[PDB]
RNA sequence: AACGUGUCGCGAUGGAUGACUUGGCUUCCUAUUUCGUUGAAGAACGCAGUAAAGUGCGAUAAGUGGUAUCAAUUGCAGAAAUUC
RNA sequence: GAUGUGGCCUGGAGGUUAGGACGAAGCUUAUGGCGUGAGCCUAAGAUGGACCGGCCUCUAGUGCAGAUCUUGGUUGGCGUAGCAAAGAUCUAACGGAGAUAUACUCAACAUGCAACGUUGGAUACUGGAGCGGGGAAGGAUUUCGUGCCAACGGCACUCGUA
RNA sequence: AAGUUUGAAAAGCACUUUGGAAAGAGAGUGAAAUAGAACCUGAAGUCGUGACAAAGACAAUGGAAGUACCUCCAUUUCAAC
């Protein structure tokens, strides 16, 4: 809240043949009488400084959220929509793809990879793996350096 | 060669002003060798500074 | 690293100086007059300018400078005798001649084929004006580059 | 645990690391023979170690470590060098992760480290 | 003619842009977390083989002691592996 | 002044497709193509050296020619105005890279000018209410010797309170 | 006010030559030296230079339509076409 305003800046008024913007007081430095407090001034305060009581979050009707989830589930059962989203389901036995519950008993990632290869879900996983790269732009420096596609979503009955 | 130091020392030793000090226009190497008060006194004795 | 390339590199000699500390405008006038000259004729010209029997013609930087009869040989009416620029250019010509001799060329056959005077980075001082004003008192150095080619 | 979610913090921890953390960071892989006989994959380089360059221009060059600078993040190797304009010989620095340790300079403390490290 | 006017190629001056950020700002969390007359916080002097600032330290002065580490520090110089 | 635009452009986020060391963004253009336009795309760099494009959606510190606008730089005026109070310097020698510095023709002048310090002479000024000796306040190493001339002493310096 | 952001690495330009020095001219390191040191890129504005276009005084700029000259550009044709 103090980011552009920590100065004792005052306007010089008219009669000095300069613009009426407030200027840094004092002397002996390069900021003496340098213009201040304005969004158009070098070290000044931005226009409408941002606040934390901006409306960051949203409230959605519960029925509309359930409606959206139901629509997304219904769309996931249409192979045309799955292909149009970008997934590679060319070798998938069936949509929706339902597998035996014994996959929860796996303890080695190798067994999981074998199961993914057998159920032909490996093409989408390979798509995601090949899609990995360095993010373009500022997010590269903002802790989101790597990007990749979204692959299959495996749904479990429980947390085990 | 600059003889400012020798002229100042001769002025102080002889108790006169710089206008009263005569450094030989010859003997410039001999005078420039002197770098102490005793050396300037030796020069004054020899007659190179009057 | 010159703005122009000599026709035959092995027959040419180059000389350069950066941040000369002579006035850029005076040096611009002084060095430009020897472009196209034989080296010896340019050196004779600089000696005669020092002797004040010939002048350096001032073009493009002659605003309200005096008129002289020695500018008539250049088709002009305003010329001066800037000695600092002349001696700096004499030193530069000596360097070019030394380079030509070390390359194995004949200094009496060289023709100056390229002269370029450019403004260098300026040096800042101050002057004090009435009513407590401080105002720039600047120095304008120059870069000078040249090469000469044997004919 | 230098690596974390925040890249700023991870880089700050890496480049402002103390001397001993820098020692740990400047580890080199052991040779296949050393991996076989110690069951350890990598060790921090040390003076008098015998190393071979695997990556860079000097790949294949073999020599004994003369210095682990730890301030320039490099190790100096006797056989790795070049001449200056004067013609005098100067040591070229190599990052330890580009070399491979072929012989260990063994001391009782380093033996204890190896026993701590071995996977058996 | 010369000054001067364009256009192109190459130079100069000048440090915008783009990339990169050990910085800032903002939010959230943890806890045997809250200085001082047993002299605090602030001031001032000083301390290195070499040492202006800065950092650290206080005539035991770029540190003594102890515990962990396990062979450096590093511009140059000086010294030179089991606790010592 | 209102409104519309599968209307253009910018920084980020979800997605989705691509591209890059056989060269990414940035930058340059008599460099062409497309669009009514905002713009988009290609080409070439004898540019660059590591990131990044298209499309759908989300988001905003999202588009400049001017505010006696802010900051930084540049710029004509301009080699111009000027650098004119306190009278002043000359001469030889020495010192210094600072000279007596030359392609031919050639006695020298007509082709190395001008400027420095010290010493000796000459000339002058301050004229004891002194550009004389000492102190306070203020300053604080400017004092001294040696070296030194990048920058500074608004001309100069080989001199200097540099 | 100010990113010391050269380069992967100082390998930070030995040596020769001119210069009183600063520097220049070569040479050398480096993939690069208009990467040579507070050095990545290096814009605009302004200036220098070489080449070319010309051009009275209509301030210059500007529109519309031609033409002269140029064009490291874009297309289309080269034969029963
Ligand atoms: K590595
Ligand atoms: K420019
Ligand atoms: K036309
Ligand atoms: Mg601000
Ligand atoms: Mg970008
Ligand atoms: Mg006048
Ligand atoms: Mg006049
Ligand atoms: Mg004044
Ligand atoms: Mg005043
Ligand atoms: Mg491991
Ligand atoms: Mg100190
Ligand atoms: Mg004590
Ligand atoms: Mg309207
Ligand atoms: Mg933004
Ligand atoms: Mg153009
Ligand atoms: Mg805005
Ligand atoms: Mg703008
Ligand atoms: Mg001007
Ligand atoms: Mg005048
Ligand atoms: Mg006058
Ligand atoms: Mg006046
Ligand atoms: Mg006077
Ligand atoms: Mg003379
Ligand atoms: Mg008198
Ligand atoms: Mg009088
Ligand atoms: Mg009198
Ligand atoms: Mg008095
Ligand atoms: Mg001066
Ligand atoms: Mg700043
Ligand atoms: Mg090479
Ligand atoms: Mg380049
Ligand atoms: Mg650059
Ligand atoms: Na041009």
């Amino acid at each position: 809240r103090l980011s552009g305003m920590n100065h004792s800046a005052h306007s010089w008024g008219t009669g000095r043949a300069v613009a009426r913007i407030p200027r840094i007081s004092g002397g002996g430095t390069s900021t003496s009488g340098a213009g201040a407090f304005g969004n158009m001034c070098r070290g000044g305060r931005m226009f409408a400084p941002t606040k934390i009581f901006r409306r960051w979050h949203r409230k959605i009707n519960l029925h509309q959220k359930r409606f959206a989830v139901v629509s997304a589930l219904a769309a996931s059962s249409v192979p045309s929509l799955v292909m149009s989203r970008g997934h590679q389901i060319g070798n998938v036995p069936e949509v929706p793809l339902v597998v035996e519950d014994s996959i929860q008993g796996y303890e080695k990632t190798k067994e999981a990879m074998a199961f993914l290869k057998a159920i032909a879900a490996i093409d989408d996983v390979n798509r995601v793996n090949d899609s990995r790269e360095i993010r373009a732009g500022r997010g590269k420096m903002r802790n989101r350096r790597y990007v990749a596609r979204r692959g299959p979503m495996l749904v479990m009955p429980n947390n085990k | 060669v600059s003889l400012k130091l020798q002229a100042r020392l001769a002025s102080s030793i002889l108790g006169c002003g710089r206008a009263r000090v005569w450094l030989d226009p010859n003997e410039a190497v001999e005078i420039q060798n002197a770098n102490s008060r005793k050396s300037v006194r030796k020069l004054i004795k020899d007659g190179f500074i009057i | 690293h010159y703005s122009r390339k000599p026709q035959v590199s092995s027959k040419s000699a180059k000389a350069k100086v950066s941040d000369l500390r002579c006035h850029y405008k005076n040096t611009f006038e002084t060095a430009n007059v020897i472009n196209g000259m034989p080296l010896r004729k340019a050196q004779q010209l600089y000696r005669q300018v020092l002797a004040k029997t010939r002048c350096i013609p001032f073009k493009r930087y002659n605003g309200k400078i005096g008129r002289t009869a020695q500018a008539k040989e250049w088709g002009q009416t305003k010329g001066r005798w800037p000695r600092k620029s002349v001696v700096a250019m004499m030193s530069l010509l000596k360097n070019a001649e030394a380079n030509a001799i070390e390359k194995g060329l004949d200094p009496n056959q060289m023709v100056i084929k390229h002269v370029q005077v450019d403004q260098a980075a300026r040096m800042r001082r101050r002057t004090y004006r009435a009513h407590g004003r401080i105002t720039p008192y600047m120095c304008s150095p120059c870069h000078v580059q040249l090469f000469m080619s044997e004919k | 645990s230098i690596k974390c979610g925040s890249r700023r913090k991870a880089r700050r921890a890496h480049f402002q690391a103390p001397s001993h953390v820098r020692r740990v960071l400047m580890s080199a892989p052991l040779s296949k023979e050393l991996r076989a006989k110690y069951n350890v994959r990598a060790m921090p380089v040390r003076k008098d170690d015998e190393v071979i360059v695997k990556r860079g221009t000097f790949k294949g060059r073999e020599g004994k470590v003369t210095a682990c600078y730890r301030l320039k993040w490099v190790i100096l190797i006797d056989k790795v060098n070049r001449e200056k304009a004067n013609g005098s010989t100067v040591a070229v620095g190599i990052h330890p992760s580009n070399v491979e340790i072929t012989k260990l300079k063994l001391t009782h403390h380093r033996k204890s480290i190896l026993e701590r490290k071995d996977r058996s």
Side-chain angles (χ1 to χ4, degrees), chain A residues 1-99 102-106 108-122 124-160, chain B, chain C residues 1-117 119-148 150-151, chain D residues 1-32 34-47 49-82 84-120:
Chain A
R1 72 181 179 90
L2 310 151
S3 284
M5 312 292 299
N6 285 331
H7 299 283
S8 342
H10 296 292
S11 175
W12 289 4
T14 55
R16 291 240 230 165
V18 294
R20 305 184 297 198
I21 192 79
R23 305 184 178 274
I24 314 282
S25 55
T29 82
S30 56
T31 45
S32 305
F37 286 175
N39 54 319
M40 80 286 286
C41 296
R42 176 174 175 268
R45 166 204 36 77
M46 66 182 288
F47 162 74
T50 46
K51 306 291 182 183
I52 66 162
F53 45 90
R54 178 205 302 265
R55 233 160 52 89
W56 304 101
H57 304 91
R58 291 301 181 274
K59 54 192 300 190
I60 308 99
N61 282 10
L62 177 57
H63 186 265
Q64 276 179 317
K65 281 147 55 174
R66 292 169 175 174
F67 205 152
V69 171
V70 159
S71 294
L73 282 178
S76 62
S77 52
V78 187
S80 321
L81 299 189
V82 177
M83 293 170 55
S84 181
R85 225 205 64 85
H87 297 280
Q88 323 266 57
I89 61 169
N91 289 97
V92 168
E94 192 173 355
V95 170
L97 177 51
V98 189
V99 301
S102 64
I103 71 176
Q104 292 188 295
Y106 293 170
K108 301 295 293 183
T109 296
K110 166 158 296 188
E111 328 167 4
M113 296 303 304
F115 153 76
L116 283 181
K117 199 279 310 174
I119 205 56
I122 200 67
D124 225 13
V125 172
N126 293 334
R127 173 188 85 110
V128 171
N129 280 271
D130 299 339
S131 72
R132 186 176 208 261
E133 66 182 356
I134 300 279
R135 178 191 297 269
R138 256 288 111 68
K140 190 190 303 98
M141 307 165 33
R142 305 260 181 93
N143 301 339
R144 36 194 125 92
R145 194 163 177 93
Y146 285 101
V147 295
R149 291 325 113 216
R150 315 236 69 78
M153 203 180 75
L154 178 59
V155 180
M156 292 300 185
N158 44 29
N159 53 324
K160 312 202 312 299
Chain B
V1 49
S2 172
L3 305 180
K4 283 299 195 195
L5 170 59
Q6 288 74 27
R8 177 182 68 80
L9 293 187
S11 293
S12 61
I13 292 173
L14 299 164
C16 62
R18 172 62 192 89
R20 303 262 304 285
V21 190
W22 177 84
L23 279 72
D24 200 323
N26 315 330
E27 322 296 336
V29 179
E30 179 74 29
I31 292 178
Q32 86 179 102
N33 284 4
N35 66 330
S36 72
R37 284 173 172 267
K38 57 124 58 191
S39 301
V40 178
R41 288 197 291 276
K42 168 89 261 188
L43 288 181
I44 292 161
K45 179 185 187 62
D46 290 325
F48 299 144
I49 296 177
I50 305 182
Chain C
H1 198 341
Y2 289 59
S3 65
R4 262 157 49 84
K5 216 179 71 174
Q7 221 78 18
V8 174
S9 59
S10 50
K11 292 306 175 175
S12 64
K14 295 193 279 186
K16 186 194 299 184
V17 59
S18 295
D19 314 304
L20 189 38
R21 195 62 192 274
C22 300
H23 278 186
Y24 151 77
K25 290 178 176 184
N26 296 339
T27 315
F28 170 96
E29 309 282 17
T30 299
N32 274 11
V33 74
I34 68 173
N35 197 347
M37 282 194 175
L39 172 69
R40 298 308 184 190
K41 304 198 182 307
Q43 299 179 309
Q44 172 186 342
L45 169 68
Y46 284 162
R47 289 191 299 270
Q48 296 182 288
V49 170
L50 284 190
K52 308 263 291 297
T53 62
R54 293 166 73 188
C55 81
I56 296 295
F58 271 57
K59 327 193 193 71
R60 166 179 314 175
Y61 297 130
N62 51 6
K64 266 84 71 57
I65 78 159
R67 303 187 281 194
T68 173
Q70 301 184 1
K72 264 138 61 180
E73 75 154 315
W74 311 108
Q76 308 290 320
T77 7
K78 297 183 292 178
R80 276 183 175 173
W81 300 264
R83 56 153 308 276
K84 253 184 68 172
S85 303
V86 164
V87 301
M89 287 305 305
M90 288 167 126
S91 299
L92 192 66
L93 281 188
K94 285 254 75 182
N95 184 258
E97 181 188 331
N99 303 331
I101 286 178
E102 185 60 18
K103 260 189 183 186
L105 312 173
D106 196 323
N108 294 338
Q109 297 287 337
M110 306 302 287
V111 174
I112 296 171
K113 307 304 288 289
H114 174 72
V115 181
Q116 179 174 295
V117 186
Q119 318 185 30
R122 292 200 188 97
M123 307 169 53
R124 179 171 299 274
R125 282 190 300 175
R126 287 132 51 99
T127 177
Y128 299 96
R129 313 309 294 263
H131 310 290
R133 284 209 310 152
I134 294 185
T135 301
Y137 205 73
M138 308 297 296
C139 174
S140 302
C142 56
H143 306 302
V144 188
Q145 64 177 229
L146 59 76
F147 60 77
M148 55 189 188
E150 180 151 341
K151 68 187 184 69
Chain D
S1 72
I2 303 198
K3 166 149 61 59
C4 53
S6 170
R7 170 175 233 261
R8 177 186 175 177
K9 177 172 174 295
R11 280 174 57 83
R12 186 177 69 246
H14 180 89
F15 291 114
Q16 300 176 193
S19 189
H20 71 280
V21 177
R22 281 165 172 258
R23 183 201 85 100
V24 167
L25 295 180
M26 293 166 59
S27 305
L30 302 170
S31 61
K32 281 176 175 294
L34 286 189
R35 287 182 175 172
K37 88 147 301 178
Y38 284 117
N39 216 129
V40 183
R41 194 157 192 87
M43 282 290 290
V45 204
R46 197 196 158 286
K47 193 201 286 79
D49 276 2
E50 299 273 338
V51 293
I52 177 173
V53 196
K54 306 302 293 297
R55 185 169 171 264
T57 299
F58 297 99
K59 58 165 75 163
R61 198 71 53 81
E62 195 154 302
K64 178 167 56 70
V65 182
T66 62
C68 300
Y69 217 101
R70 290 202 207 166
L71 187 57
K72 300 200 270 268
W73 296 100
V74 292
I75 57 172
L76 303 176
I77 307 163
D78 59 358
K79 218 62 60 176
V80 179
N81 54 82
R82 61 171 300 127
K84 309 169 53 64
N86 273 7
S88 43
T89 304
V90 72
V92 173
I94 313 290
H95 198 266
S97 63
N98 295 323
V99 312
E100 171 192 307
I101 296 180
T102 71
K103 197 193 190 311
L104 291 162
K105 166 75 174 189
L106 283 176
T107 158
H108 172 268
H109 290 318
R110 219 175 180 199
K111 297 177 199 178
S112 57
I113 300 163
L114 283 173
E115 298 176 44
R116 283 157 33 195
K117 297 294 252 59
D118 82 309
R119 281 86 56 94
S120 303

